Design a protein around this nucleic acid. Structure first.
Lengths: 428, 26, 107, 54, 54, 53, 53
DNA sequence: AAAA
DNA sequence: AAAAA
DNA sequence: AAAAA
C-alpha cells in the first residue's frame, strides 16, 4: 500500500555499561559502536578505575590512557566494500574470520566470543591498523595475523604488549644507525666536489633514520600534508591522560597492628567532541595502564664506565656536537648487565649530562608490594622496549580480576536517519 | 560514591518508542 | 517516602500497597547481533531507509545474541527489521564470569 | 514472578505476530480492488497485535 | 570523442532500464506483504540506474 | 580569460588544462514526435497527470 | 505502491531555433506549439530577415 | 497522527 | 519513570 | 601529555 522512501532525523540512545579488566602495559578494546554515513556522533564516558589490592601501602601512582578512533569499512575491505554498496540488495556477503572455541578468545576486541567460531573481520582488522600506526615502535615490523585464532592465549586474552615510557634504554636510537660512512677516493687523489655530494646523501639518510620512517612524515618535511585516506590510517578523535591514586587501610588486630594496605580508586571522564561521520564504519575505544620504568639495579653512566676520559667528563661543546653516536653496553647502566651483541645499542654523545636516573636503596630490593623492575630488563632490544606484565606480579595480591579493573558508563548519543519501530512493523 | 556508572544501564531516552508488547506492562 | 494525595472513597472496599525490587538485566555471555550473525548482507549493514521501513519483522534465534544459545522452535522470536542500530548492549569481561558478589545473569 | 526490565530479549514482539498474509487471487486474474480491501483488514489485525489487546 | 549537448536522442535513459518487474506469486494465492517488499527492492534498483552508478 | 584561484599543493603531482569545442546539436531532418507517430491515442495527446506520472 | 493523482504548476521551456525561407507573397508557417487546457502561454520571437542578393 |  | 542530580 | 595542582 504505502511505500516509505525517507526518514526523519531521530535521536538514538546507544548508552551501555562496561565491566573491564586487564594487565599492565597491554592495549585492550573497551567499547565500540558501528555507525552509518551521515550520522552525528557524540561520546562521554564516566567511571572508576581500580587496581588489585596491594601487599603494602601506596608508593607509586600509575598512568592511564584512553583513546578513540574512527575506521571506515573501506579501509578494512577495500574494493570489496566498493562493489558491496554499488550492487545493493543482491550484493555478496562480506568475508569473515575464524575464532577460537573458548569464551575469552576475543577479549582484546571487547566482545564475548560467539559459539559458532565465526565473526565479521572489521573489528580484528581495525585493531591491527591502530596498533601498527600509533603504538608499536616505528622500526619494528607490522603485525599481520589473518584471524583472531592465529594469536596466542596471552594476546587474545589481554592484548598486545606496548612500549615502556621513554628512557635511555627504552628509547634507544633505531637499529639502522650508522657510525661510519665510506667513500671511494683515488689511490693518491680525491675529488672534493664529490666529497660535498657525499655529505648531502648522508644527510638525507639520517633524516629517514631519525625522523621520517613513514610516508606521511616524508610529505610533512616538504611542508605538505596527507589525509588519513591517503595512507589508509585510522583517525584519532580524542586522547585522555590521568593518574590514579587512593588511600590506605590500617590493621587493628594483634598480628597486623602496624601494617597497612593500599587501594587505588580513581574517577575519570573521557569526553569526545561532536563528530560528523562521512562513511559507514566503526568507532572504537581502548585503554592502557603503565608504570614509570624504575629499575632497582640501575646506576649512572659515569659510575658504570669507571675510567673517565676528557670526552666523557669535560662537556666541551665542540666535541659534543661534532662526534658520531656512541655505542654502549647494558653493563654500563645496570648491575650484571651484558656485553654481547644483543646487549649493545647507540645513544647520543653526551646524553648523561641531560638526564639523571632514579635511585633505589638496597633495602628495597626483593621486597613485595613495591612496583619495580627487579634487576634489569632482559632480552634483546625488541624484548627490552616492550613491557612484560609478569614482572609486576609481586606487587599485587592474587585475584580473578587481573591487575586492574574498571566500571564505566558510556553515554552515546547519535542523530540518525532511520525509520521508527512503528514504521518498521506496520505494513500500511 | 558512584552515581552515573552504578545507577541504570543506559542513557536517558529522548526519541521514538522502541518496545511494543501489546499494552501496558509495568 | 511514598505519599498518596487525598482521596475520596465512593464505596466500601480496600486499599492495598505493594512493593517490587528488580535489577537491570545484564547477562555475562551476551554479544552484538552483527557479531553473532557473522556473514553480513546489504540489508543487515547498510541501514537503507527504504529497506528498513518496508520489510516484515525478522525472526532470530537466541544463538545470535548469547553464547551457547539455542536454535530450536522454543529459542526463536521476532524483532524489528533493524533493531540493532537503535541500541547497544553492555559488555562484561570474561574475568568477571563465575565471580561471587556481582549481581549478574550467569550465561 | 514479574517481568524483567525491557530489553531486546525480555520485550519481544507478541507471539501472535505474522510475517505473511495470503490472498485468494484467481488462476490467471486478480481483483485489485479486492487487494486494497486485504490491506485494510491486515492493518486492523496489526493494531490489535501491537497496541490493543485489552 | 566526447558527447553531444543534451537532447532527447543524445541523452537517453541508460540501457539498463527495465519496463517490467516480475514476482513469484502462488498458483491461486499471493502474499501481500511480500508484494510490499518487492516494491522496496525495485526502488533501490531504479535509484542506481538513474542517479547512482558511481 | 581563464583564471584559477590560488591553490595549496599538498603532494607532488601535475596540473593539466584541457579545451573542448562543440556546436548545439541541430539536425536538418528532425520533426516533432506527435508528427512522426501519426495515429494519436488518448495517452499521447491528453496530457492527463494521472497517466503521465 | 504510491499512486499520483495531481501535479504542481511547473515552468516549461519550449524555446527553439528556426531557419526559414520562402517566396514573395506566399503564406508559410514558421512555428507551432501544441497546448493543453489550463496552460498559461507567452511567446517572444527575435531574429533577422534577409532577401537574396 | 503517531514517539498508540 | 531503569538510565547521576 | 609521565613528571602536584
Amino acid at each position: 500500500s504505502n511505500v516509505q522512501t525517507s526518514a526523519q532525523r531521530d535521536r538514538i540512545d546507544l548508552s551501555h555499561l562496561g565491566f573491564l579488566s586487564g594487565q599492565i602495559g597491554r592495549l585492550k578494546t573497551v567499547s565500540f559502536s558501528p555507525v552509518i554515513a551521515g550520522d552525528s556522533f557524540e561520546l562521554d564516558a564516566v567511571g572508576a578505575l581500580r587496581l588489585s589490592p596491594l601487599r603494602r601501602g601506596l608508593a607509586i601512582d600509575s598512568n592511564v590512557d584512553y583513546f578513540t578512533f574512527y575506521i571506515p569499512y573501506r579501509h578494512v575491505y577495500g574494493q570489496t566494500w566498493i562493489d558491496f554498496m554499488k550492487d545493493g540488495v543482491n550484493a555478496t556477503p562480506l568475508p569473515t574470520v575464524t575464532t577460537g572455541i573458548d569464551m575469552d578468545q576475543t577479549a582484546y576486541l571487547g566482545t564475548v566470543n560467539p559459539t559458532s567460531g565465526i565473526m565479521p573481520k572489521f573489528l580484528h582488522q581495525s585493531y591491527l591498523n591502530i596498533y601498527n600506526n600509533y603504538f608499536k615502535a616505528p622500526w619494528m615490523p607490522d603485525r599481520t595475523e589473518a584471524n583472531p585464532s592465529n594469536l596466542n592465549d596471552a594476546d587474545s586474552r589481554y592484548g598486545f604488549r606496548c612500549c615502556h615510557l621513554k628512557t635511555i634504554w627504552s628509547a634507544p636510537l633505531p637499529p639502522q644507525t650508522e657510525i661510519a660512512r665510506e667513500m671511494t677516493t683515488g689511490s693518491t687523489t680525491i675529488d672534493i666536489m664529490g666529497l660535498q655530494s657525499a655529505y648531502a646523501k648522508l644527510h638525507t639518510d639520517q633524516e629517514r633514520d631519525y625522523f621520517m620512517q613513514r610516508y606521511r612524515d616524508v610529505i610533512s618535511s616538504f611542508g605538505g600534508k596527507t589525509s588519513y585516506d591517503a595512507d589508509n590510517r585510522p583517525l584519532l578523535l580524542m586522547r585522555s591522560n590521568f593518574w590514579a591514586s587512593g588511600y590506605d587501610v590500617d590493621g587493628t588486630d594483634q598480628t597486623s597492628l602496624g601494617q597497612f594496605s593500599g587501594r587505588v580508586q580513581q574517577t575519570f571522564k573521557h569526553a569526545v567532541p561532536r563528530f560528523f561521520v562521512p562513511e559507514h564504519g566503526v568507532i572504537m575505544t581502548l585503554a592502557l595502564v603503565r608504570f614509570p620504568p624504575t629499575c632497582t639495579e640501575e646506576h649512572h653512566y659515569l659510575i658504570g664506565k669507571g675510567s673517565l676520559t676528557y670526552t666523557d667528563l669535560a662537556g666541551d661543546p665542540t666535541l659534543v656536537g661534532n662526534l658520531p653516536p656512541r655505542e654502549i653496553a647494558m653493563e654500563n647502566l645496570f648491575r650484571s648487565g651484558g656485553t654481547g651483541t644483543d646487549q649493545k645499542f647507540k645513544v647520543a654523545e653526551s646524553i648523561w649530562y641531560r638526564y639523571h636516573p632514579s635511585y633505589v636503596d638496597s633495602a628495597y630490593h626483593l621486597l613485595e608490594g613495591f612496583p619495580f623492575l627487579q634487576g634489569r630488563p632482559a632480552g634483546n632490544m625488541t624484548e627490552r622496549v616492550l613491557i612484560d606484565h609478569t614482572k609486576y606480579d609481586s606487587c599485587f595480591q592474587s585475584t580473578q580480576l587481573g591487575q586492574w579493573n574498571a566500571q564505566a558508563k558510556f553515554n552515546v548519543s547519535v542523530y540518525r536517519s532511520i525509520p521508527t519501530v512503528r514504521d518498521s512493523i506496520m505494513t500500511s | 560514591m558512584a552515581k552515573s556508572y552504578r545507577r541504570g544501564s543506559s542513557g536517558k531516552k529522548k526519541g521514538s518508542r522502541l518496545w511494543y508488547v501489546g499494552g501496558s506492562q509495568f
